[PDB]
C-alpha cells in the first residue's frame, strides 16, 4: 500500500 | 451539461468556452465536481470531445496562481501525448496567467531543469521525465495538491507501474490522486488501492453490487441492549460502518459508543447534503473510526473493511445497498449482523432474498 516516505518540505 | 453551474472561475470559464468546450456530458461534469471537491477520482473515459481537457479543466480550477510553485503533477505514457495536454491545459489556462510545462527532455532537459525551477503550477511528462527532474532536483515536490494519472491504461499495465510508483514516493501523504484511463482492467484496479483512498469510480459501462466476496455473519445478540455490549466485545481495531434503521437508534448507540473510547462519526437521512458531506470528509479522512447512520444515502457508501448491521432492514434490498461490493470495481470484506431473537426470521428471510449463507459470527479475524 505505497507511502509517501522518501519526501520531505 | 453546463459549466457556469458549477462555480468554476471566471478566468478559466472564458478559457473554457474560448477553447470551444461545449457544455459538458454528464459523466465529465460528474468527474470535475469530484475532482474539485478534492477527492480521489478513477475516471473511466472514452473518445469525445473533452477527453483530457475534462481533466484539464479541473486542474485548472483547483490551481492558486500567485502560489507560483507546482501544484499539480500530471503524467502521460509519452512525451507526445504530454505536449497535447501541455497545450491543452495553456489553451484553456490563457486567461489565468497560468504555468505549465512538458518535461519533454527532450534536448534540452537544460531548458526543462531551466523552465522548472523557474515556477510550474502545472507539470506534465513521461513518469521517467519526471522522475528525472526529481532527482535531479529540478522539480519541486513540496506543495502538490494533486497527481494525475492519464491514460493509464498505457502507463501502469505496460511497463511504467515501476517509474510511476517511484514518483508517487516522493510527494506530500495523501496527495490526491485521479486516474484517467479508458481501460480499466482488474490488473490496473488493484493498482489504485494501492495509492487511491475511498475512491470514486466513474466508469462507462454499469456495473451492479454483488454480494459474493463478502464474508456475512450474525451475532444472537438476542435482546437489544445485548447489542452495544456485543459490539464493544466485538472491536478488539480499524474502519467500519455501523447501520441502524433508524435516526433514534444512531443517536443513541453514537453517545453510548462514545463513552466508550471510540471515535465516531454519525449520520441521518434527515441532514442537508453539505452535512452529511461534511461529516463523511472526516470519516474518509480517518479521524474517525466507527461511522453510524441511517440508509438514507444507502441507495453511502465509503468503501469499508468492515461493515455492521446494529439493526435489520425490513426492506430486504436495503441490505446489499448497505452491504456489497463492488462488483467487479471494488473490495471484499465482511459484514455482521446483530440479530435479535425476533429479528431472525428477517434474517433467514433476507439470507433467501439473496440466496446467500450467513453463518455465525465463530470469534476470528479474517
Redesign the interface.
Known amino acids: 500500500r505505497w507511502e509517501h516516505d522518501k519526501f520531505r518540505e | 451539461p453546463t459549466f457556469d453551474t458549477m462555480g468554476l472561475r471566471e478566468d478559466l470559464l472564458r478559457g473554457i468556452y474560448a477553447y470551444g468546450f461545449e457544455k459538458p456530458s454528464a459523466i465529465q461534469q460528474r468527474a470535475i465536481k469530484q475532482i474539485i471537491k478534492g477527492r480521489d477520482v478513477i475516471a473511466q473515459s472514452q473518445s469525445g470531445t473533452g477527453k483530457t481537457a475534462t481533466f484539464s479543466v479541473s486542474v485548472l480550477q483547483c490551481l492558486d496562481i500567485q502560489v507560483r510553485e507546482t501544484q499539480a503533477l500530471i503524467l502521460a505514457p509519452t512525451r507526445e501525448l504530454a505536449v497535447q495536454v501541455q497545450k491543452g491545459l495553456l489553451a484553456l489556462g490563457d486567461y489565468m496567467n497560468v504555468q505549465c510545462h512538458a518535461c519533454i527532455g527532450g534536448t534540452n532537459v537544460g531548458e526543462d531543469i531551466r523552465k522548472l525551477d523557474y515556477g510550474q503550477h502545472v507539470v506534465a511528462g513521461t513518469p521517467g521525465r519526471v522522475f528525472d527532474m526529481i532527482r535531479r532536483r529540478s522539480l519541486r515536490?513540496?506543495a502538490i495538491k494533486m497527481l494525475v494519472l492519464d491514460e493509464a491504461d498505457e502507463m501502469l499495465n505496460k511497463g511504467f507501474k515501476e517509474q510511476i510508483?517511484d514518483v508517487?514516493?516522493?510527494?506530500?501523504?495523501?496527495?490526491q490522486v485521479v486516474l484517467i484511463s479508458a481501460t480499466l482492467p482488474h490488473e490496473i484496479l488493484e493498482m489504485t488501492?494501492?495509492?487511491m483512498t475511498d475512491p470514486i469510480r466513474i466508469l462507462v459501462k454499469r456495473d451492479e453490487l454483488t454480494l459474493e466476496g463478502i464474508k456475512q455473519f450474525f451475532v444472537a445478540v438476542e435482546r437489544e441492549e445485548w447489542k452495544f455490549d456485543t459490539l464493544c466485545d466485538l472491536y478488539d481495531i480499524t474502519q467500519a460502518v455501523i447501520f441502524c434503521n433508524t435516526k433514534r437508534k444512531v443517536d443513541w448507540l453514537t453517545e453510548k459508543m462514545r463513552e466508550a473510547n471510540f471515535t465516531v462519526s454519525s449520520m441521518h437521512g434527515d441532514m442537508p447534503q453539505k452535512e452529511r458531506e461534511s461529516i463523511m470528509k472526516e470519516f474518509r479522512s480517518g479521524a474517525s473510526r466507527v461511522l453510524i447512520s441511517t440508509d438514507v444515502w444507502a441507495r453511502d457508501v465509503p468503501q469499508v473493511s468492515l461493515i455492521i448491521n446494529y439493526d435489520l432492514p425490513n426492506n430486504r434490498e436495503l441490505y446489499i445497498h448497505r452491504i456489497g461490493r463492488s462488483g467487479r470495481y471494488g473490495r471484499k470484506g465482511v459484514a455482521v449482523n446483530f440479530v435479535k431473537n425476533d429479528d431472525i426470521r428477517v434474517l433467514r428471510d433476507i439470507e433467501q432474498y439473496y440466496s446467500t449463507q450467513i453463518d455465525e459470527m465463530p470469534m476470528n479475524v479474517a
Request: charged share 20%; no cysteine; proline share 14%.
Open positions: 515536490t513540496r510508483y508517487y514516493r516522493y510527494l506530500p501523504p495523501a496527495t488501492n494501492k495509492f
